[PDB]
Amino acid sequence: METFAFQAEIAQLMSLIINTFYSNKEIFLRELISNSSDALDKIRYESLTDPSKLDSGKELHINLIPNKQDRTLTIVDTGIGMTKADLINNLGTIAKSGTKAFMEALQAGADISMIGQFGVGFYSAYLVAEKVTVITKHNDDEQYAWESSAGGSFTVRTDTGEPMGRGTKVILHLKEDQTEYLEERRIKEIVKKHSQFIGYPITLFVE
Numbered sequence: 001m002e003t004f005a006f007q008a009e010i011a012q013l014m015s016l017i018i019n020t021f022y023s024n025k026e027i028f029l030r031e032l033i034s035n036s037s038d039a040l041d042k043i044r045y046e047s048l049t050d051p052s053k054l055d056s057g058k059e060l061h062i063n064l065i066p067n068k069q070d071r072t073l074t075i076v077d078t079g080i081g082m083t084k085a086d087l088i089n090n091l092g093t094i095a096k097s098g099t100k101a102f103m104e105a106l107q108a109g110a111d112i113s114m115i116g117q118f119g120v121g122f123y124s125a126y127l128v129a130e131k132v133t134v135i136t137k138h139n140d141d142e143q144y145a146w147e148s149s150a151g152g153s154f155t156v157r158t159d160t161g162e163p164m165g166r167g168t169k170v171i172l173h174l175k176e177d178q179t180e181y182l183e184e185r186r187i188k189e190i191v192k193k194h195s196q197f198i199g200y201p202i203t204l205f206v207e
């Protein structure tokens, strides 16, 4: 396990998301499903030129998995996944520029719900989660686990968990007062409201 420091802009956005009073927390789900949909679009588009890109899995889907015992909500996709370089470097570049643009927009009067327009919608996970664990497998790299409970750092390690084939799992370790996001009726309501037209099958798992 390697530990890394967030750059100042992203650390400030994470604190803003964690500290600001904002009741419309449900938008986190739309943001993570949109990220998954974008990753699925990417691998699907690559497979049009190279069909072997799907040798790691032909199914293109999104699963939403609640676990009441562990207090986790997991968003699983079979999209392109992220390499180690994406996790540490490339997405750090995106997080920096997107945070700067988002912070400028917020000062102008934009809403926290507009976060996705800035390419940093993933960070909306911190509206409901105390810790986010990301398990990911890209065709060009090994399976990795990225994790952060904010506080200015994140970790990255090779993951020894169940091999995924290809794709990403965003595991939300929910805050104690955010357990409504584990309820079937609540997740179904949110998906219908914000994610009804996503071009991949979304399966809401139950317990």
Ligand SMILES: O=C(N[C@@H]1c2ccccc2-c2c(-c3nc4ccncc4[nH]3)cccc21)c1ccncc1
Binding pocket: 006, 007, 010, 035, 036, 039, 077, 079, 080, 081, 082, 086, 087, 088, 089, 091, 092, 093, 094, 095, 119, 120, 121, 122, 134, 146, 167, 168
């Ligand atoms: O949401 C996704 N990716 C996430 C995403 C989207 C935008 C910006 C950063 C990140 C990010 C990061 C990350 N943020 C950082 C800030 C500073 N330094 C390094 C960083 N790495 C780590 C794991 C997952 C994601 C995604 C979901 C499904 N498939 C592909 C990507």
